Design a protein around this motif. Structure first.
Motif, PDB file in Angstrom:
ATOM      1  N   UNK A 121      40.464  25.962  32.069  1.00  0.00           N
ATOM      2  CA  UNK A 121      41.116  27.167  32.581  1.00  0.00           C
ATOM      3  C   UNK A 121      40.076  28.219  32.965  1.00  0.00           C
ATOM      4  N   UNK A 122      39.070  28.425  32.113  1.00  0.00           N
ATOM      5  CA  UNK A 122      38.005  29.358  32.454  1.00  0.00           C
ATOM      6  C   UNK A 122      37.199  28.912  33.660  1.00  0.00           C
ATOM      7  N   UNK A 123      36.918  27.607  33.758  1.00  0.00           N
ATOM      8  CA  UNK A 123      36.209  27.084  34.927  1.00  0.00           C
ATOM      9  C   UNK A 123      36.975  27.366  36.206  1.00  0.00           C
ATOM     10  N   UNK A 124      38.301  27.259  36.146  1.00  0.00           N
ATOM     11  CA  UNK A 124      39.121  27.577  37.309  1.00  0.00           C
ATOM     12  C   UNK A 124      38.980  29.052  37.657  1.00  0.00           C
ATOM     13  N   UNK A 125      39.072  29.925  36.649  1.00  0.00           N
ATOM     14  CA  UNK A 125      38.863  31.355  36.881  1.00  0.00           C
ATOM     15  C   UNK A 125      37.496  31.613  37.513  1.00  0.00           C
ATOM     16  N   UNK A 126      36.437  31.033  36.936  1.00  0.00           N
ATOM     17  CA  UNK A 126      35.094  31.189  37.489  1.00  0.00           C
ATOM     18  C   UNK A 126      35.036  30.754  38.950  1.00  0.00           C
ATOM     19  N   UNK A 127      35.565  29.568  39.261  1.00  0.00           N
ATOM     20  CA  UNK A 127      35.484  29.095  40.641  1.00  0.00           C
ATOM     21  C   UNK A 127      36.339  29.947  41.567  1.00  0.00           C
TER      22      UNK A 127
END
Lengths: 209, 205
Positions: A121-127
């Motif tokens: 979920x955080x990786x999605x936010x980052x991207x």
């Protein structure tokens, strides 16, 4: 006979628990263990390769395929000309399936699995925040991960096929917020809240298309 | 490049709307229309045949395959060892999908389609009464026919795969009549609830 021998060959492979990537015994050995002709076993292996269970590697051997019997477009959606209709139909499926998935995940996910969900979920936010187009593929992986953790084996197989087709055929602030609400419901082991958060996400994403 | 030409060949097949069982133009003409070499089109056709889209009939021609891009056991369920769990998991999918299918059929089906559905419902009754075991496959066909008439293209492709996998691993007669009645009266809520009750009953058995 060929299809029958292919079935027994498949049964032999499952009984011996050959891992993915394992090399099969040569066809002389298989033909003897199954008491069939060499020509018969050659055709049976080719039948299982056509079904993506085996990989015939010319010059090496025949191996347990990493595809595990599933092709690239396994339900034939590439043959559908009306991709706007197919997209709407696939969102109808997602609306019927994914809220139950989220409900099941809330009910059975463990702490280590949840940790991996939250990193994705955080990786999605980052991207998303970086305008990095790979977020679209991370989004697919998030839903596939939920399908895996639902513990429904058929869901685990099916939802990647549905969501990958939508992705290949084919607000960002609202999706990030929706992911946080879904994780929150799962983190608090609240199945009804997870169900509703996912349901409202799919309906919002569908409306955006 | 081979896979690029395979994509272009698929597009051509879709543009020209070749039906199942149609013979493709020969590979000289295909390569000419696609502005590509003879060896490239030969491999592109093989690529589409591998995908179950085309049938290469040695001695005859290359044809639009009735598989329509879908193999036997297209989701690899034959590799799943826990068949009891997979069965329960597939019924959970049916419970989530089939009631909406029945709802959509009641909304959408035409009189000529309904006649075909009612004939299959009668064929199932006759086979059950005659002790003919083909009724189990006719029952699968009944649900596939509902998914077809639902007008949801994904449902039409997917439900046969679900119900075929369950199959491979007199209350039903009454349920079929209730479902048909709701459809014939164009009542989507009643069709939904009749199908939901039926699936939950079958799952319990």
């Amino acid at each position: 006979l060929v299809e029958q021998t292919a079935d027994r060959l498949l049964h032999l492979i499952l009984e011996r628990e050959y891992p993915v990537g394992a090399k099969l015994p040569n066809e002389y050995e298989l033909a003897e263990d199954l008491d069939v002709g060499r020509s018969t076993i050659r055709e049976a292996v080719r039948s299982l390769a056509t079904r993506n269970i085996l990989e015939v590697r010319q010059g090496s051997g025949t191996y347990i395929s990493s595809k595990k019997g599933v092709s690239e477009d396994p339900l034939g959606f590439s043959l559908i000309k009306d991709t706007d209709r197919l997209t709407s139909d696939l969102f109808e499926l997602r609306l019927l399936l994914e809220p139950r998935i989220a409900e099941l995940v809330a009910y059975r996910i463990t702490d280590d699995q949840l940790q991996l969900l939250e990193k994705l979920v955080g990786d999605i936010e980052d991207a998303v925040h970086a305008g990095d187009p790979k977020h679209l593929l991370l989004d697919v992986e998030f839903h596939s991960m939920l399908a895996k953790y639902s513990g429904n084996i058929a869901m685990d197989s099916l939802l990647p096929v549905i969501n990958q087709s939508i992705h290949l055929i084919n607000m960002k602030s609202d999706s990030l917020e929706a992911h946080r609400e879904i994780i929150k419901a799962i983190r608090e082991k609240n199945p009804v809240a997870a169900h509703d958060a996912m349901l409202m996400h799919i309906m919002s994403v569908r409306r955006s298309a």
